[PDB]
Structure 1
Amino acid sequence: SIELSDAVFGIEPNNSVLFEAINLQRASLRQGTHAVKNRSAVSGGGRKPWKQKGTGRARQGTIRAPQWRGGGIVFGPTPRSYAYKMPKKMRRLALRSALSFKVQENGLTVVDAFNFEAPKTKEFKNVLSTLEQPKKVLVVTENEDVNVELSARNIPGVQVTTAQGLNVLDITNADSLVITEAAAKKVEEVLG
């Protein structure tokens, strides 16, 4: 019926940038919030256990040294961040490649608008069964559809995103893609 420009959904995927984007998104979801205690942080251990020489024993300075039991940890984990950035032109390629990979395997179908009047999970289950969709599916909307979002949010393997906020991880994770024509046009226009 309708035809989309081949700049999107019609290009050879680039696996290097896709892998880099997937790694970037996975690393940006990670918070450290991990720490240990070094020699100075542990309580006590100011004096010297015994004199330097005079008895037959190893020379020691504190009771909180790493070789002791209960002393501080040297070179442990420290709180930090793992996020990093990538040039803007390379982010656009990482999304078009994912969409093209989705469309090559016949995993993109276009439907009309969702005129839901009440949030009903059973109705969404039936319409999914009619469309013959797999267990994992991603559906986009032109804006935030409150009625569509309230439903389909308790069925395992079903997630909803907007036209603007398309993710790289979500497209790769999903098994099938269902898009409305208005949202498809918005994606074709706004996205390069």
Structure 2
Amino acid sequence: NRSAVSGGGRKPWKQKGTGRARQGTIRAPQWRGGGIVFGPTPRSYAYKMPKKMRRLALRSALSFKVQENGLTVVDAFNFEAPKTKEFKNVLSTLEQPKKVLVVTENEDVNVELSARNIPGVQVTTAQGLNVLDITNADSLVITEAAAKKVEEVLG
């Protein structure tokens, strides 16, 4: 703004006597190189909503995903070492779309290490579910333990 720009302390010329517009500083808004008025300033954009509405939104996303046949309940993911090709073949066997979200109960290291370099796949746990992850994903693949945890935690 005016005060933060370097210089511009003295008056450029006398108030009257010569034929010129009256000016007070060389860093006024209408000068070239002067201060800015009503510009950007750092702030935060976050806000909140009632706890009861944060849960009604998540169940709505799960229900909409279930409505269009985008839910796939499977058995345990039995991986002993990270390997991308095995999970790619598993995804292609179950006939899954390009964008898929896979949900488990705890942090599975051998599942998350693979299936993460494939463009369009993300891994999450039961207590890490998002409104954005569910809406952005095209289909949902879950485990029975994860499904039970999701049913018991929510309501």
TM-superposed deviation, 1:49: 0.2
TM-superposed deviation, 1:156: 0.2
What is aligned with 1:119?
82
Q: Percent identity?
A: 100
Q: For 1:50 and 1:91, how far apart are their aligned partners in 2?
A: 62
Q: Deviations over 1:89-115 (max 9, x none)?
A: 001000000000000000001000011
Using the size of structure 2 for normalisation, the TM-score is: 0.99
What secondary structure, in the 3-state scheme, does the structure 2 residue paired with 1:77 have?
Answer: coil
Q: For 1:59 and 1:69, how far apart are their aligned partners in 2?
A: 16
Q: Which protein has the larger Cα radius of gyration, Structure 1 or Structure 2?
A: 2
What secondary structure, in the 3-state scheme, does the structure 2 residue paired with 1:134 have?
Answer: coil
Q: For 2:11 and 2:115, how far apart are their aligned partners in 1?
A: 67
What secondary structure, in the 3-state scheme, does the structure 2 residue paired with 1:164 have?
Answer: helix
TM-superposed deviation, 1:182: 0.4
What secondary structure, in the 3-state scheme, does the structure 1 residue paired with 2:127 have?
Answer: coil
Q: Deviations over 1:155-183 (max 9, x none)?
A: 00000110011000000000000000000
TM-superposed deviation, 1:142: 0.7
User: How many residues were matched structurally?
Assistant: 155
Using the size of structure 1 for normalisation, the TM-score is: 0.80
Q: For 2:101 and 2:71, how far apart are their aligned partners in 1?
A: 10
Detail structure 1 runs of 4+ shifted over 3 Å in the superposition: none
Q: For 2:97 and 2:50, how far apart are their aligned partners in 1?
A: 35
- For structure 2, the residue ranges without an aligned partner over 5 or more in a row are none
Q: Deviations over 1:15-54 (max 9, x none)?
A: xxxxxxxxxxxxxxxxxxxxxxx00000000000000001
- For structure 1, the residue ranges without an aligned partner over 5 or more in a row are 1-37
TM-superposed deviation, 1:191: 1.3
What is aligned with 1:129?
92
TM-superposed deviation, 1:79: 0.1
What is aligned with 2:133?
170
Q: Deviations over 1:109-144 (max 9, x none)?
A: 100001100100000000000000000000001100
Q: For 2:24 and 2:131, how far apart are their aligned partners in 1?
A: 55
Q: For 1:174 and 1:43, how far apart are their aligned partners in 2?
A: 51
Q: Aligned-residue CA RMSD in angstroms? A: 0.4
Q: Deviations over 1:71-93 (max 9, x none)?
A: 00000000000000000000100
What are the residue-to-residue correspondences of 1:1-192 with 2, within 5 Å? 38-192=1-155
